[PDB]
Amino acid sequence: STIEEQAKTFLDKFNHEAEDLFYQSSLASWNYNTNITEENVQNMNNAGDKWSAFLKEQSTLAQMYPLQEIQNLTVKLQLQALQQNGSSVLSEDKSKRLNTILNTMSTIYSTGKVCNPDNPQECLLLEPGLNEIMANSLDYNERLWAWESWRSEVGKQLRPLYEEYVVLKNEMARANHYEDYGDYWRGDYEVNGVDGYDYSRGQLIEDVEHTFEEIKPLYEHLHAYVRAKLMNAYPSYISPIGCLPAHLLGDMWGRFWTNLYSLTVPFGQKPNIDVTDAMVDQAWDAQRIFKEAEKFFVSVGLPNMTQGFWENSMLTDPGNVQKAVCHPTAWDLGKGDFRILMCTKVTMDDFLTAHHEMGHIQYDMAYAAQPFLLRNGANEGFHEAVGEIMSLSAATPKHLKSIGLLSPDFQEDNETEINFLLKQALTIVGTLPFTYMLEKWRWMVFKGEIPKDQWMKKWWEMKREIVGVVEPVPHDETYCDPASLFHVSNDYSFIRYYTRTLYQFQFQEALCQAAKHEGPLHKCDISNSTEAGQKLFNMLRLGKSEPWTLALENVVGAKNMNVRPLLNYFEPLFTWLKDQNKNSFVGWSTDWSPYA
Amino acid sequence: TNLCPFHEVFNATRFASVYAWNRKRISNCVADYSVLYNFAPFFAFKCYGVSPTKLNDLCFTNVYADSFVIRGNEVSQIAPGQTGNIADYNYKLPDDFTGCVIAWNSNKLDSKVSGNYNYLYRLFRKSKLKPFERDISTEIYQAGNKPCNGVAGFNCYFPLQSYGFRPTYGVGHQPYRVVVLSFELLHAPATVCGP
Ligand SMILES: *[C@@H]1O[C@H](CO[C@@H]2O[C@@H](C)[C@@H](O)[C@@H](O)[C@@H]2O)[C@@H](O[C@@H]2O[C@H](CO)[C@@H](O)[C@H](O)[C@H]2NC(C)=O)[C@H](O)[C@H]1NC(C)=O
Ligand SMILES: *[C@@H]1O[C@H](CO)[C@@H](O[C@@H]2O[C@H](CO)[C@@H](O)[C@H](O)[C@H]2NC(C)=O)[C@H](O)[C@H]1NC(C)=O
Ligand SMILES: *[C@@H]1O[C@H](CO)[C@@H](O)[C@H](O)[C@H]1NC(C)=O
Ligand SMILES: *[C@@H]1O[C@H](CO)[C@@H](O)[C@H](O)[C@H]1NC(C)=O
Ligand SMILES: *[C@@H]1O[C@H](CO)[C@@H](O)[C@H](O)[C@H]1NC(C)=O
Ligand SMILES: [Zn+2]
C-alpha cells in the first residue's frame, strides 16, 4: 500500500461526497437567487456552511499526504488544490481578524453612501446613485463631486483596514511559502513537472509587461483621440497634452471608457446596428433568444442544451412579488444539472448576453467528465474568454443577416465599421492600462516596494504614467483610492481581466482561421463551421486537467499569451486613429493636473 | 398453467441496492415474456447468446431474474466483460453471459427532492467480484497500513456509498431500475417454457 494509492482512494471518497454536498449548496443558492425569502436565505447559508466545513475538514486530511511522493500528475493536481484550499495556516486569532476586516471593507463598499452638499438629507449609494452620475452626467462639477465624495468619505474609512489587510494576507502567503500575497495570486498560472509547458509565477509579470508594451501605440492613439474629442466638449477643463481627468472617463474609476462613446463617436450621423426593433417586430421572446443561441452552438458541432436546462432554468423575470437576483449567470450545479439565471428582456444586448452565458454552459458541460477538482477553466481567464468570443460572432452583421434580424438591405459602409471598433476599443482596450496599472500597484504593495506613506503618491504617479489619467484633486495618505473599487476592497485578483482579454482574441483568430474566414478578423462569424467547434472543444473538455499553456495550444497553436491577435482585431481602427491624430499631440505629460 | 411472476420482479414497490442485488428464481411456469413489453421506455433491452425476437421459442432448466437500481451512466456496465465500480464491486456478468438485460428510467419513483439515500453501491473492495457474486458486508475498508477497529477514520472508509437521487439530476445521474434475466441450461427436465 503506497502513499499514492492511499491518495487515489482518498480522492475517490472526496469526489463522491463533494458532488452531493456541492449540489445541495448550489441548489440552495439557486433557490435564494431566484426566490428571495427569509427562509431560502437560511437554507443557502446552512448548506453553504456544511459545504465549507466539509472542505476545511478535507483540506486537513488532504495535507496528511505528502505531495512529493506522488508520481501521478493528475493526482498531484487534485491533492494540491485541496491542500492550498487550506488557510488553516494563520493562527485562529489572526484568521478571525482577517475575516472581520474582509467583512468590514465589504460592508463599507456595499453600504457606504455620500450626501449632497446642498441637501444633507438626499444621499446616494454607489449602486445605483453614484454610478448613475458617472455613466450619464455630462456636468463637470457633478461628476467631480461624486468622484471625490466616494473617495474622501468611503475611501478614507477603508485606508486603515487595507493596511491591516495587506499585513495579514502577506503573513498568510509567506507561511504558505510564497514571497507575498501577490505571488500567491500569480500561482493560478503556475505549471510544474511538465517539460515544455512549465510556467513560473515570475514569468507572468514579464509576459504581462512584454505584451503591454505592444499595446501602448494603440492606447496612446486611442487616448489622443479621446482627449481631443473631450477637449472640444470641455475646452476649459482639459489640456491638449495632459492626462485625462479621472472623473470624465465614463464610470467611477475609468475601468471602462464605454460611456464616452456619445462624445467620442467618429461618425455620429450613422446608426449603431440595433436589431432590438426587429426582434420585437417578429415577436421574439426569451425562449426564442435561447433557442437561437442553442442553434448557434449546434451549428459548430457542440451538443444542444440538456432537457433539464429548459425545465430548471429561469430565462425571464418572474416579476410580481417574487424577486430574484437578475445578474446574468450560468450555473453548473453538478450531477448533470446545468441552468442559466437571467431576467431576459427582448433586446439585442440580452440576445448577445445569452450567447455569452450559454458559452459558459458549453465549457461546463465539456469538462463535466473530469474529476470534480478539475472542473474549471484552464486558468482564471479561460472561462470568461470563451464567453466573450460567442458574443463576438453572434453580433457581426453576417450572423444577424442569416438569422433574419437584419435584412440584406443593410449595407455595411466603412464608417459604421469604424464606429463599431471605436466603441469596442473604449471597453476592450481602455481597460487594459487600467487593469495592468492597478494590479501592478497591488503586486508592488504586497512585495513591499511601496511604503505606506507613499501609497497614494505612487498610485497617482502610476495613473499619470501608465494610464494617462490624472486625479482632479490632490489626495494625501489618508485616502485609499484602489480600495474604492470593488475588486480591491473585496479581495479579488485583477490581472485575470488582462489575460482573458488577450486569450479571447487569440481564440477568435484561431477559430476564424479554422472557419476559413476571409477579411478583417472583426467581421468573423464561426457559425456553421465544425472545424472551429472541434478545435475549441479539445480545450473545453480539458478543464484544469492539463496545463493552461497546453490547453491554449490545442486552440491557437502557441504555448503563451500573445497580443498580436488583439492588434489584428483593431488594426482598421488603429490606422484610422493614426490618421485622425495627424494634427494632434500623441502622448501625455504627467506634470499637468486640473488643480493648477 | 400458471404464469411466471414477472410482475413481482418488475413492478416491485422498491428495488434492491445494487451491492445487495435481488435474485428471484423462476421455475415451473409458462413464460409470457411478451408481457414485459410494458414499462415502455425499456431504455436498454440487450440479449446475449439469444435473441429477443420470439424469445418464447425456448426451454430452460431455470431462469434467474436479478433486479437492482443504478444510475444512468452505469447501465452500460451491466454487460459481459465490462469494468467500473458496478461491474467490479457490485454485480458482474460472466464473459459468456446467456440472458438479457432490461433497464428503464425510474426518476419518478426513486428520486426525492431531499435526496433518496435508500439506494447504495459498493465503492471499495479488496478485489473484483466473480460473476454473479454478491458481497453484502459492511466491514470498514482499510486503505492505509494500520487497522481500522470497525470504525471509519483516516485511511479507513465505510465501503458502501449512496446515490442521493434527486429529480433534477441529469439523465446520467438519474435512477434506473435494471432486470437481468439469466437463462440456465443444464442436464435436467428443462421445465420453463410457454407459447
Ligand atoms: C476554497 O474553495 C472554495 C470553494 O471552491 C469550490 O471548490 C472548488 C474545488 C471548485 O469546484 C470551485 O468551483 C468551487 O466553488 C472557495 O470559495 C469560493 O470563494 C469565491 C470567492 O473567494 C466565492 O465567489 C465562491 O462563492 C466560494 N465558493 C462557494 C461554494 O461559495 C474558497 O475561496 C477557497 N479557499 C481558499 C483559501 O482558496
Ligand atoms: C495517473 O493516474 C490516472 C488514474 O487516476 C491514469 O489514468 C487512468 O489510467 C488507467 C490505466 O491503469 C485507466 O484504466 C483509466 O481509464 C485512466 N483514467 C482514469 C480517469 O482513471 C493515468 O494514466 C496516470 N498517469 C500516469 C502517468 O501514470
Ligand atoms: C417562493 O418561496 C415562498 C416561500 O418563502 C413560497 O411561498 C413561494 O411559492 C415560492 N415561489 C416559487 C416560485 O418557488
Ligand atoms: C438535440 O437534442 C435531442 C434530444 O432528444 C437529441 O436527440 C439530438 O441528438 C440533439 N442534437 C440535434 C442535432 O438535434
Ligand atoms: C471609406 O471609403 C471611402 C472611399 O471608398 C474613403 O473616401 C473614406 O475615407 C473611407 N472612410 C474611412 C473612415 O476610412
Ligand atoms: Zn461571463
Side-chain angles (χ1 to χ4, degrees):
Chain A
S1 152
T2 166
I3 185 140
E4 179 150 299
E5 291 155 354
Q6 297 177 30
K8 281 207 272 252
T9 325
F10 167 72
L11 293 169
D12 258 345
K13 196 64 215 333
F14 170 83
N15 291 316
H16 287 90
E17 209 155 338
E19 321 195 4
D20 185 52
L21 283 168
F22 178 83
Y23 189 96
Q24 298 180 55
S25 171
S26 288
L27 187 47
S29 277
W30 172 269
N31 293 320
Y32 166 66
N33 273 262
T34 40
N35 186 8
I36 303 195
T37 82
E38 185 58 46
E39 193 227 34
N40 283 337
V41 167
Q42 284 288 324
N43 303 66
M44 180 188 75
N45 301 126
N46 295 347
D49 280 349
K50 284 168 184 168
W51 167 240
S52 305
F54 166 73
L55 276 177
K56 184 166 325 302
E57 148 194 351
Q58 300 288 308
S59 269
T60 312
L61 269 90
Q63 287 155 6
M64 290 182 228
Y65 302 90
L67 206 65
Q68 42 159 345
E69 322 259 20
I70 322 184
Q71 264 60 38
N72 196 279
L73 284 320
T74 308
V75 173
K76 239 214 199 183
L77 274 206
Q78 300 188 72
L79 275 182
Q80 154 187 320
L82 251 191
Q83 295 165 3
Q84 74 183 105
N85 196 255
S87 53
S88 299
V89 59
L90 279 172
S91 60
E92 304 173 80
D93 188 59
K94 295 179 163 161
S95 198
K96 276 190 244 134
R97 269 137 55 129
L98 174 64
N99 287 316
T100 293
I101 291 173
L102 292 167
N103 295 74
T104 305
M105 299 202 282
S106 185
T107 295
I108 296 171
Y109 186 88
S110 66
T111 72
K113 71 198 154 93
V114 303
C115 304
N116 154 281
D118 322 3
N119 183 272
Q121 258 268 299
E122 81 146 273
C123 305
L124 286 177
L125 301 167
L126 180 74
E127 186 67 38
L130 296 181
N131 283 339
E132 197 274 338
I133 299 177
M134 293 318 258
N136 297 289
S137 180
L138 301 181
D139 178 86
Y140 188 94
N141 294 325
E142 188 182 13
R143 299 182 63 81
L144 175 50
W145 166 75
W147 188 96
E148 169 68 17
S149 310
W150 179 246
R151 271 146 199 91
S152 85
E153 266 152 74
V154 177
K156 297 198 185 209
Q157 294 182 52
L158 300 170
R159 174 59 186 251
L161 290 162
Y162 207 76
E163 291 177 340
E164 217 171 330
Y165 155 90
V166 168
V167 161
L168 295 166
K169 282 289 190 187
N170 266 341
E171 301 194 23
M172 179 272 270
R174 279 150 172 80
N176 285 72
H177 305 100
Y178 294 82
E179 307 160 21
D180 46 71
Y181 192 43
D183 196 29
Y184 180 103
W185 271 346
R186 292 193 291 279
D188 197 90
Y189 303 90
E190 182 170 15
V191 173
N192 287 295
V194 190
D195 184 72
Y197 293 94
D198 284 352
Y199 199 96
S200 77
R201 306 192 294 259
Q203 201 63 45
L204 172 69
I205 305 178
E206 290 317 309
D207 288 329
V208 168
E209 298 175 335
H210 276 334
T211 57
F212 187 77
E213 200 71 43
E214 329 186 58
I215 285 151
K216 292 186 186 183
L218 176 58
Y219 183 59
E220 289 200 5
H221 281 274
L222 184 66
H223 181 287
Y225 172 72
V226 169
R227 170 176 62 193
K229 302 288 295 188
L230 284 191
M231 180 166 18
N232 290 344
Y234 302 98
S236 68
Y237 296 114
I238 281 163
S239 160
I241 64 158
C243 300
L244 302 166
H247 67 297
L248 293 171
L249 293 178
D251 60 45
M252 186 57 102
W253 319 263
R255 181 187 173 194
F256 303 105
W257 293 5
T258 306
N259 296 311
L260 293 182
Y261 184 73
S262 65
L263 286 184
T264 64
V265 47
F267 308 105
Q269 297 281 45
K270 249 60 164 50
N272 317 344
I273 288 200
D274 197 331
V275 313
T276 287
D277 267 338
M279 280 175 352
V280 200
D281 278 8
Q282 309 168 18
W284 284 35
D285 49 352
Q287 182 78 2
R288 175 79 185 271
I289 294 174
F290 281 93
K291 288 294 199 213
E292 283 293 311
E294 178 197 59
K295 210 188 296 192
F296 163 83
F297 292 104
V298 169
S299 58
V300 306
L302 296 164
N304 42 15
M305 292 329 248
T306 71
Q307 204 225 321
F309 176 88
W310 300 106
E311 292 179 340
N312 312 314
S313 295
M314 204 190 78
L315 313 181
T316 36
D317 204 315
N320 318 332
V321 181
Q322 181 178 352
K323 266 63 163 134
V325 174
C326 280
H327 178 40
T329 55
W331 291 72
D332 173 13
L333 297 87
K335 305 208 158 295
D337 194 358
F338 303 104
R339 304 173 189 196
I340 280 184
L341 201 180
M342 189 173 171
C343 304
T344 311
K345 325 286 163 23
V346 172
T347 75
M348 173 178 194
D349 277 351
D350 281 353
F351 165 82
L352 299 185
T353 305
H355 290 65
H356 172 120
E357 291 308 314
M358 203 170 269
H360 287 300
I361 300 283
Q362 290 286 349
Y363 208 170
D364 295 337
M365 288 183 352
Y367 57 54
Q370 294 279 353
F372 176 86
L373 292 163
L374 309 180
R375 299 184 192 154
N376 216 316
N379 61 43
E380 48 193 27
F382 265 66
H383 227 293
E384 223 40 73
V386 164
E388 292 278 344
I389 72 178
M390 291 327 152
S391 37
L392 284 184
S393 301
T396 77
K398 177 205 291 174
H399 189 91
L400 293 168
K401 261 168 161 213
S402 72
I403 70 177
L405 295 175
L406 195 71
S407 68
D409 268 19
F410 201 102
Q411 193 61 71
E412 257 274 280
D413 57 345
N414 55 358
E415 306 190 345
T416 54
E417 310 229 299
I418 290 295
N419 275 359
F420 172 82
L421 291 190
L422 194 274
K423 199 180 218 311
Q424 291 285 80
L426 291 181
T427 315
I428 300 166
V429 170
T431 196
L432 292 179
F434 174 98
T435 295
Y436 163 60
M437 169 263 145
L438 187 160
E439 190 82 316
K440 201 212 192 324
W441 178 90
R442 286 207 297 189
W443 286 347
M444 264 184 276
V445 160
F446 296 142
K447 253 183 235 213
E449 297 174 4
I450 304 180
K452 265 190 283 216
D453 63 287
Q454 290 174 26
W455 273 14
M456 293 292 92
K457 190 194 182 196
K458 208 60 58 192
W459 172 263
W460 283 113
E461 284 190 3
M462 291 186 247
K463 277 279 188 188
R464 295 167 191 242
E465 160 188 347
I466 301 178
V467 197
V469 167
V470 60
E471 76 275 26
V473 184
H475 287 176
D476 55 26
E477 303 300 330
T478 69
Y479 291 80
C480 191
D481 299 349
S484 82
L485 179 58
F486 169 82
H487 307 65
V488 175
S489 56
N490 288 248
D491 187 40
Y492 287 109
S493 97
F494 212 67
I495 203 57
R496 89 223 297 161
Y497 303 106
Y498 182 95
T499 67
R500 167 229 94 182
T501 293
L502 269 61
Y503 297 155
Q504 85 188 45
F505 292 108
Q506 285 184 269
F507 288 3
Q508 188 73 344
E509 173 174 284
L511 299 199
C512 300
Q513 218 158 286
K516 288 151 172 343
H517 178 56
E518 274 130 26
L521 172 60
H522 86 271
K523 305 187 71 174
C524 165
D525 178 16
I526 66 179
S527 287
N528 286 340
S529 170
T530 72
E531 280 83 2
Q534 264 285 150
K535 184 158 271 333
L536 178 62
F537 186 86
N538 289 347
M539 179 267 298
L540 298 200
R541 57 161 263 100
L542 293 177
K544 274 185 71 169
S545 75
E546 295 296 317
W548 72 264
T549 55
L550 177 46
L552 182 56
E553 190 177 66
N554 289 10
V555 197
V556 317
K559 279 165 187 162
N560 223 356
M561 140 189 69
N562 190 344
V563 66
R564 191 198 52 72
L566 179 122
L567 304 179
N568 183 20
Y569 184 92
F570 287 109
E571 202 179 332
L573 179 76
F574 185 41
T575 58
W576 183 87
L577 291 181
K578 294 191 278 186
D579 229 311
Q580 274 288 314
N581 299 336
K582 63 229 158 205
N583 47 21
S584 325
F585 179 88
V586 177
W588 54 83
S589 186
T590 65
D591 72 282
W592 180 94
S593 77
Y595 56 91
Chain B
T1 334
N2 41 331
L3 290 317
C4 295
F6 285 128
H7 213 90
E8 284 183 335
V9 175
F10 284 67
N11 232 15
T13 285
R14 157 190 283 101
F15 269 44
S17 303
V18 70
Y19 91 94
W21 46 278
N22 213 84
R23 188 166 254 203
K24 175 88 171 263
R25 185 171 177 183
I26 301 287
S27 70
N28 310 155
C29 50
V30 42
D32 303 6
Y33 301 74
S34 49
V35 316
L36 296 193
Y37 312 69
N38 293 26
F39 310 76
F42 270 0
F43 163 66
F45 196 127
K46 277 73 221 24
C47 294
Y48 306 82
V50 66
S51 55
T53 41
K54 255 102 69 173
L55 202 67
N56 273 123
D57 267 15
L58 292 157
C59 278
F60 293 94
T61 305
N62 280 280
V63 186
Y64 296 119
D66 304 316
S67 55
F68 48 77
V69 154
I70 47 192
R71 52 138 153 151
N73 329 111
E74 297 171 330
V75 175
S76 69
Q77 302 192 39
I78 306 327
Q82 272 279 277
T83 165
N85 272 347
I86 298 294
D88 295 348
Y89 302 149
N90 297 263
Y91 185 72
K92 176 103 217 73
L93 288 176
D95 300 311
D96 52 24
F97 165 61
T98 309
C100 302
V101 171
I102 298 102
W104 67 97
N105 180 292
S106 60
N107 191 48
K108 207 77 163 54
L109 293 176
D110 295 332
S111 284
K112 288 190 352 183
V113 165
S114 266
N116 191 23
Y117 294 86
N118 172 53
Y119 296 99
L120 311 188
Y121 68 112
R122 188 167 299 278
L123 188 44
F124 310 124
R125 214 177 164 261
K126 261 87 144 153
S127 65
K128 293 179 179 179
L129 254 52
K130 318 163 205 286
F132 296 113
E133 187 181 344
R134 180 201 298 112
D135 185 354
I136 70 158
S137 68
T138 67
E139 191 223 359
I140 292 275
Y141 180 84
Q142 186 193 231
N145 300 291
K146 294 55 153 213
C148 306
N149 307 355
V151 47
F154 182 66
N155 273 135
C156 287
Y157 319 105
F158 189 71
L160 295 179
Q161 292 298 130
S162 185
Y163 283 117
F165 290 121
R166 296 182 171 79
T168 50
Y169 288 177
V171 191
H173 291 80
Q174 285 173 6
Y176 281 69
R177 285 166 183 231
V178 180
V179 174
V180 179
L181 305 170
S182 320
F183 295 120
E184 212 181 26
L185 218 71
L186 303 169
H187 205 162
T191 63
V192 177
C193 309

Short mmCIF file of all heavy atoms in Angstrom, two decimals, chain A residues 124 131 169 197 231 241 254 260 316 448 458 499 513 520 552 577 589:
data_model
loop_
_atom_site.label_atom_id
_atom_site.label_comp_id
_atom_site.label_asym_id
_atom_site.label_seq_id
_atom_site.Cartn_x
_atom_site.Cartn_y
_atom_site.Cartn_z
N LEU A 124 -26.80 59.14 -1.47
CA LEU A 124 -26.68 58.21 -2.58
C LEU A 124 -25.66 57.13 -2.28
O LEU A 124 -24.58 57.41 -1.76
CB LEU A 124 -26.27 58.94 -3.87
CG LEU A 124 -27.32 59.81 -4.57
CD1 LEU A 124 -26.70 60.50 -5.77
CD2 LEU A 124 -28.51 58.97 -4.98
N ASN A 131 -23.02 55.63 -9.46
CA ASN A 131 -22.74 55.06 -10.77
C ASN A 131 -23.58 55.72 -11.86
O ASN A 131 -23.12 55.86 -13.00
CB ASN A 131 -22.97 53.55 -10.76
CG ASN A 131 -21.85 52.79 -10.09
OD1 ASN A 131 -20.73 53.28 -9.98
ND2 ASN A 131 -22.15 51.57 -9.65
N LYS A 169 -2.68 39.28 5.03
CA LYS A 169 -2.64 38.49 3.80
C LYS A 169 -1.22 38.12 3.42
O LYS A 169 -0.98 37.06 2.85
CB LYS A 169 -3.32 39.24 2.66
CG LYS A 169 -4.84 39.20 2.70
CD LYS A 169 -5.37 37.82 2.34
CE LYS A 169 -6.88 37.84 2.14
NZ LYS A 169 -7.44 36.47 1.96
N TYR A 197 6.01 22.83 -21.06
CA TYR A 197 4.77 23.52 -20.74
C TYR A 197 4.81 24.20 -19.38
O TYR A 197 3.79 24.73 -18.92
CB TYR A 197 3.58 22.55 -20.81
CG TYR A 197 3.29 22.06 -22.20
CD1 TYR A 197 3.83 20.87 -22.66
CD2 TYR A 197 2.50 22.80 -23.07
CE1 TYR A 197 3.57 20.42 -23.95
CE2 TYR A 197 2.24 22.36 -24.35
CZ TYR A 197 2.78 21.17 -24.78
OH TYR A 197 2.52 20.73 -26.06
N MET A 231 -11.75 67.49 -25.23
CA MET A 231 -11.35 68.89 -25.15
C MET A 231 -12.32 69.80 -25.89
O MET A 231 -12.56 70.94 -25.47
CB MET A 231 -9.94 69.07 -25.72
CG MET A 231 -9.42 70.49 -25.69
SD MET A 231 -7.64 70.56 -25.97
CE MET A 231 -7.37 68.94 -26.70
N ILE A 241 -2.19 68.34 -24.01
CA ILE A 241 -1.03 67.47 -23.83
C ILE A 241 -1.03 66.77 -22.48
O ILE A 241 -0.12 65.98 -22.21
CB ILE A 241 0.29 68.24 -24.02
CG1 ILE A 241 0.44 69.32 -22.95
CG2 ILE A 241 0.37 68.84 -25.42
CD1 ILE A 241 1.86 69.76 -22.72
N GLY A 254 -12.86 54.89 -14.29
CA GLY A 254 -12.23 54.77 -15.58
C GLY A 254 -11.80 53.37 -15.93
O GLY A 254 -10.93 53.20 -16.78
N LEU A 260 -18.04 56.97 -22.87
CA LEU A 260 -17.52 58.11 -23.61
C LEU A 260 -17.89 58.07 -25.09
O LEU A 260 -17.49 58.97 -25.84
CB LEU A 260 -16.00 58.20 -23.48
CG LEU A 260 -15.43 58.52 -22.09
CD1 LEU A 260 -13.91 58.61 -22.14
CD2 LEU A 260 -16.03 59.82 -21.57
N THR A 316 -36.63 34.40 -17.66
CA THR A 316 -37.37 35.65 -17.63
C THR A 316 -37.54 36.08 -16.18
O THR A 316 -37.44 35.28 -15.25
CB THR A 316 -38.75 35.53 -18.29
OG1 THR A 316 -39.30 34.24 -18.03
CG2 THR A 316 -38.64 35.74 -19.79
N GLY A 448 6.19 44.87 -0.93
CA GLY A 448 6.84 45.83 -0.06
C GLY A 448 7.64 46.90 -0.76
O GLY A 448 8.40 47.61 -0.10
N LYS A 458 2.31 57.03 -5.04
CA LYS A 458 2.69 56.15 -6.14
C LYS A 458 1.49 55.75 -6.98
O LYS A 458 1.62 55.56 -8.20
CB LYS A 458 3.41 54.93 -5.58
CG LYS A 458 4.42 54.29 -6.52
CD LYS A 458 5.53 55.25 -6.92
CE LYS A 458 6.26 55.77 -5.70
NZ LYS A 458 7.14 56.89 -6.07
N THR A 499 -5.39 39.11 -18.91
CA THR A 499 -5.06 37.88 -19.62
C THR A 499 -6.25 37.35 -20.41
O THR A 499 -6.09 36.86 -21.53
CB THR A 499 -4.57 36.82 -18.63
OG1 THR A 499 -5.64 36.42 -17.78
CG2 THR A 499 -3.43 37.37 -17.79
N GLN A 513 -9.59 31.19 -38.31
CA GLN A 513 -8.67 30.52 -39.22
C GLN A 513 -9.19 29.14 -39.60
O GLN A 513 -9.12 28.74 -40.77
CB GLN A 513 -7.28 30.41 -38.58
CG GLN A 513 -6.13 30.62 -39.55
CD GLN A 513 -4.85 31.04 -38.83
OE1 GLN A 513 -4.72 32.18 -38.39
NE2 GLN A 513 -3.91 30.11 -38.72
N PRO A 520 -11.31 41.16 -42.57
CA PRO A 520 -10.90 41.60 -41.23
C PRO A 520 -11.44 40.67 -40.15
O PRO A 520 -12.57 40.19 -40.23
CB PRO A 520 -11.49 43.01 -41.12
CG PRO A 520 -11.73 43.44 -42.54
CD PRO A 520 -12.09 42.19 -43.27
N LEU A 552 -4.11 26.12 -24.10
CA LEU A 552 -4.05 27.22 -25.05
C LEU A 552 -3.56 26.74 -26.41
O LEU A 552 -4.07 27.18 -27.45
CB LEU A 552 -3.14 28.32 -24.51
CG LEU A 552 -2.98 29.59 -25.33
CD1 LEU A 552 -4.32 30.24 -25.61
CD2 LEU A 552 -2.05 30.57 -24.62
N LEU A 577 -7.09 55.92 -36.43
CA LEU A 577 -6.71 56.78 -35.31
C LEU A 577 -5.41 57.52 -35.61
O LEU A 577 -5.29 58.72 -35.32
CB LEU A 577 -6.56 55.96 -34.03
CG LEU A 577 -7.84 55.38 -33.41
CD1 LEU A 577 -7.51 54.63 -32.13
CD2 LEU A 577 -8.85 56.48 -33.14
N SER A 589 1.63 64.37 -20.84
CA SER A 589 2.59 64.89 -19.87
C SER A 589 2.06 64.65 -18.47
O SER A 589 0.92 65.00 -18.16
CB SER A 589 2.84 66.38 -20.10
OG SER A 589 3.87 66.83 -19.25
#
